[PDB]
RNA sequence: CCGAUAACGAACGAGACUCUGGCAUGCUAACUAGUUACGCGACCCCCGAGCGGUCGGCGUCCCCCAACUUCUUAGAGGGACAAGUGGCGUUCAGCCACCCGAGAUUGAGCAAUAACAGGUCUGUGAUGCCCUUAGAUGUCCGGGGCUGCACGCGCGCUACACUGACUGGCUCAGCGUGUGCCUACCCUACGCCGGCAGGCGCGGGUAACCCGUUGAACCCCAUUCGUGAUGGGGAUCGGGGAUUGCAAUUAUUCCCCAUGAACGAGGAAUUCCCAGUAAGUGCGGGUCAUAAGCUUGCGUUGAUUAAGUCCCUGCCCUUUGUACACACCGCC
């Protein structure tokens with residue numbers, strides 16, 4: 023146990039990933055070498071801790087976004103998210119089940135008596151609401 | 158008259174018990190009848206998968 | 222002591238330090254002794270870096286009522302040239318150079334020289 | 335009678351001096367030359 | 378083939394109970410020329426399970442202060458005791474030791490903290506590693522107590538302890554202690 | 567009890583008792599606990615822990 | 618730390634850090650460390666072994682008369698990061714196991730805001746006030762005392778035995794010290810005398826140059842003893858002999874010959890401890906003219922149990938109550 027990282031390594035890992043995402047990769051030794059010149063880290067023992075957290079975070083980044091961000095990642099998600107627009111809309115149903123009261127509302131609005139609207143049998147009982155208190 | 162001494166296999170370790178952590182609750186299944194599986198408590202270092210003797214079948218079952 | 226200590230604090234910070242800390246402990250006009258502490262800025266205490274980051278001094282002041290102890294700790298500012306500050310940077314201090322942002326990934330070209 | 339047989343006092347907080355006690359009371363609120371300062375001295 | 382002490386083949390010894398099969402370490406993989414190795418068997422949990430049981434015996438037989446590090450002396454004691462039991466019973470000393478461990482390991486116990494009636498409140502069944510631990514402890518303590526104030530040496534007392542435990546004859550200290558402990562668990566079921 | 571019961575399927579009875587406590591006894595026996603100033607205003611009973 | 622989130626961004630402490638240990642047949646090197654190779658020997662050899670074997674025997678920076686850093690030393694660089702794989706987890710923080718690996722938690726040092734009328738005025742030319750200051754509470758000198766013994770307690774050492782004791786042989790360390798301002802006092806090799814403690818000459822070493830290849834103990838292998846307060850134990854005491862010191866009585870210490878006491882594993886209780894650890898076992902430093910049953914370190918041999926819990930004992934955080942705030946050693 024006792025391998026929980028510290029703010030000192032986490033802040034630095036986030037910052038260097040944000041700054042040098044293009045230069046860096048998902049190889050530990052490559053990351054521990056690029057860090058040696060992209061940051062003046064006084065200690066080797068902290069440098070390779072930073073490199074390990076960097077590899078962990080970048081392995082995460084390849085799959086999904088995290089709290090640390092990158093502008094290219096934002097643009098990639100924007101250009102990818104506008105997808106699976108169906109060939110047929112989910113809101114063009116051939117029939118629409120409609121209530122008698124809402125049908126009265128439509129005829130008030132003058133847009134009633136549409137062919138697409140199909141009135142349904144109103145519910146009977148008025149058995150909504152839940153029983154009060156426990157039991 | 159005595160029920161014969163039998164053997165069982167630990168399938169899972171539930172967790173420590175005894176208010177000193179001196180025993181563990183584990184789940185055991187019988188090789189003599191794999192469907193029959195009860196909750197036993199044992200003392201000593203227990204890993205999952207190990208088999209162990211049982212002098213008597215039904216003593217107590219309690220949830221933590 | 223409040224005037225003198227605050228003047229010393231101001232002089233230290235004006236001459237430029239990450240922080241400083243003075244303690245005056247002893248008896249003034251009363252039997253019961255009191256210690257008064259005045260701090261400002263950063264001040265590290267533990268580990269190796271304190272040895273070459275913090276300048277310490279302890280003096281005795283002989284008053285008619287007895288003895289007054291003065292303790293002074295000054296966290297020196299980091300100095301690359303090292304004449305007025307420590308040479309090494311703080312071990313936990315990590316600083317990252319910003320990229321040039323001169324990417325320019327345009328159409329391929331060849332430049333002869 | 336405030337001490338045991340050896341001579342250590344049985345009530346360490348109970349101050350034995352009439353001039354001063356556990357807490358440091360400040361003379362004249364820390365005023366005068368050879369004294370701790372006050373708010374006016376700080377500013 | 379391994380020839381523990383140059384003899385006493387390991388491949389003829391079987392652990393007849395599956396409950397102890399995977400904790401006794403007399404098989405060919407754990408078979409070793411000598412009962413001595415600085416193997417870091419207490420590095421972590423369950424590491425002693427793969428430790429050879431003859432090694433465990435020679436590690437538990439160095440006790441009670443005056444002899445805590447004398448592994449060479451304990452190894453020679455184990456050597457002499459194994460030779461004695463081989464010439465006395467007529468089978469493999471390793472098989473004798475395995476059967477002794479099986480019969481010495483108390484199958485149950487009892488443990489609580491509350492107001493005990495006779496010894497301890499709640500009966501419980503022990504783990505196989507606890508079986509091996511307590512069997513080795515009981516056998517070693519029985520041999521040590523037997524060879525305290527008599528002419529009979531440690532090797533001979535250990536020998537008769539294993540011989541009596543391997544069959545069950547009510548005179549072995551380990552067997553008697555197991556009987557008492559099983560009885561108190563039975564009464565405090 | 568079920569093993570020694572003569573009947574084939576006996577539904578063992580239940581003891582129904584309505585205890586009343588003074589607050590001294592209730593707090594001493596930990597039926598009720600001291601709660602924060604905000605928590606005191608919650609009249610919802612503690613959960614049954616049924617699952 | 619992650620997450621929740623009227624907070625966001627930080628700082629001290631923790632961590633990071635320094636030292637130490639573990640790995641580099643990779644680098645720089647070494648007559649104050651050596652190793653291989655080779656040459657002279659010395660012996661076993663002769664069956665003949667013959668590029669046979671042993672040599673801490675002598676040599677090859679005797680500087681012209683080999684190389685090399687593996688062993689040793691000490692510098693710079695590396696290397697380990699939960700990095701790789703599987704499983705669990707909000708699939709986050711991380712946790713478990715396994716592979717490759719020398720190492721997958723080596724030990725320390727440093728160490729916050731503060732509090733303890735905690736301890737030291739017998740550490741000081743640190744120090745206020747009081748006391749004494751010539752028949753001194755200054756200072757010196759002689760002797761005694763700090764050890765004094767119906768008794769109680771604490772840290773300890775040695776034992777109770779055969780898992781042993783004695784006798785002999787074999788065989789292995791690492792810390793580290795070593796000749797002095799004052800200051801008088803060093804570590805010791807070699808030879809000789811004595812049985813020992815010791816004594817007498819002759820060096821070496823201000824030190825990886827000499828002690829020293831620190832021939833340590835435990836242990837290992839052989840002898841005797843034989844369950845007997847006994848060849849276990851060596852307490853108490855008699856006599857004698859040496860050493861240091863100006864001085865050994867109230868025995869400084871050491872040696873030799875004698876008596877041989879309790880003690881046959883220890884009530885109620887109680888201490889310390891998780892891997893090169895406990896424990897067994899010796900060796901240095903400090904104290905020192907003489908002094909270790911102490912302490913601080915080092916090495917050797919080397920385990921059982923556990924990878925959990927709040928039962929006991931405590932401590933911390935939150936909620937809560939407060940007439941306390943010099944804060945329960947309170948107030949009343």
Ligand SMILES: [Mg+2]
Pocket residue numbers: 267268
């Ligand atoms: Mg630290």
Ligand SMILES: [Mg+2]
Pocket residue numbers: 875876
């Ligand atoms: Mg005598």
